[PDB]
Structure 1
Amino acid sequence: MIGLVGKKVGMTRIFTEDGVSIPVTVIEVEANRVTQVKDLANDGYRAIQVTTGAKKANRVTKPEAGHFAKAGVEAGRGLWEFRLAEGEEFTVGQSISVELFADVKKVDVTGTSKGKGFAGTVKRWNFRTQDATHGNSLSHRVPGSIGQNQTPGKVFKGKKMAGQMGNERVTVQSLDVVRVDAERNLLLVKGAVPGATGSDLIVKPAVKA
């Protein structure tokens, strides 16, 4: 099944009548609109390409404009593809709504996590710090040894080291979908989903379920 392209609004909480507080991520899912419908014949696979949001007509480029124009649709902030299953047809101008998620119970939300920048091994890989005292010289959060002497005589590939942490695609799976609000174009899912406030989020029905 296809998914939608929301925006992370923020977190809040839904008190139940029973007493339970449910922590929700508010995902604003304005109307995703189809641009392109790919197939086995021309493109080699079934999929739909969708867009969402608005964009400055002065800041959308010519080629971008043309693509949208062909579709017969407004220029949105991006383009996103969704592979179609057997028996999933979609027309080119068609607009999909959060209404689509009313039947589903769980979702996989996918997005670009917050960027920590250059992170050391303690933050990045949970490396245990070395001793804060007892003689320890200039080597408190340093990663320790990184190999074995002479054989293999090299650091192995994939060695856990400091480096760029976050700002990368992550998928949280099986998040229970609390509320679908078609009126306000909202989707409340339980629990935290990746990335900062205002970030794009791809919501899909959960693959494992």
Structure 2
Amino acid sequence: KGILGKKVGMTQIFTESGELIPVTVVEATPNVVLQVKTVETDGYEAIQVGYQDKREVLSNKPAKGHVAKANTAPKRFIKEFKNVELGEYEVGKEIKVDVFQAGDVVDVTGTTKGKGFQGAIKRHGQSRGPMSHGSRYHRRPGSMGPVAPNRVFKNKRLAGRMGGDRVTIQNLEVVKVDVERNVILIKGNIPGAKKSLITIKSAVKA
């Protein structure tokens, strides 16, 4: 089980017994199965799924042709779901939030917010140097290694662009599902900025 949605934002909900829990609101307009991949034609089993209807002027003839099989409007996001039952899916079939029931344990994948160029202290959580006692070493990435190699070993972590990485959070919980609004409330927080793509799947660990 899986679906693609948009990270609407964060709020909180009162459950039964009055406990207050933080939830992420993810909207998922019914996704459309655009293609079914098999061992014969592609060498593996998976279903391609499209989401977020796109204005025609923003699409290409190749993109319009590709979705013509599913007989729907152009989709902004397209992703393949594996480890599913191909028998239950076919081109043109729709997937709605009601695939998940409240209390389901899921894995949520997103693209982390971009922090741009960042120093080692923030990027890798390294330690600062002393800020006084004559210290002239505050936010630098530490030594680069021993003398003997006459080089720097790989993975010597330094400053650079931060964020914007594919991150999965495992074993989140589906607090609620609102089919009319095409909304899923997931306990906790998930990677990515608001309006970014989100991928909900049934937790692999379970």
TM range (shorter): over 0.9
Classify 1:125/1:81 alpha carbon distance in 2 versus 1 (closer, same or farther; 3 Å): same
C-alpha separation in 2, matches of 1:167 and 1:173: 18
Classify 1:87/1:77 alpha carbon distance in 2 versus 1 (closer, same or farther; 3 Å): closer
- Counterpart of 2:168 in structure 1 is 171
Paired residues in the alignment total 206
**C-alpha displacement of 1:103:** 6.8
- Unaligned residue ranges in structure 2 (runs of 5+): none
| Aligned AA (2:175) | V
**C-alpha displacement of 1:55:** 0.7
Moved more, 35-44 or 69-78: 69-78
SS where residue 52 of structure 2 aligns?
A: coil
C-alpha separation in 2, matches of 1:103 and 1:60: 36
**% same residue:** 50
- Counterpart of 1:140 in structure 2 is 138
SS where residue 58 of structure 1 aligns?
A: helix
| Aligned AA (2:13) | I
- Counterpart of 1:116 in structure 2 is 115
- Counterpart of 1:69 in structure 2 is 68
C-alpha separation in 2, matches of 1:104 and 1:119: 38
Aligned partners of 2:8 and 2:25 also within 8 Å: yes
Q: 1:194 aligns with which of 191, 203, 206?
A: 191
Aligned partners of 1:104 and 1:205 also within 8 Å: no
After TM superposition, the runs of 4+ consecutive aligned structure 1 residues lying more than 6 A away are none
C-alpha separation in 2, matches of 1:111 and 1:21: 25
CA deviations 1:109-159 (Å, max 9, x no partner) are 00000001111110011111001011112x21011211001x122111111
2:35 maps to 1:36 = yes
**C-alpha displacement of 1:71:** 2.6
TM-score by length of 1: 0.94
- Counterpart of 1:48 in structure 2 is 47
Moved more, 96-105 or 47-56: 96-105
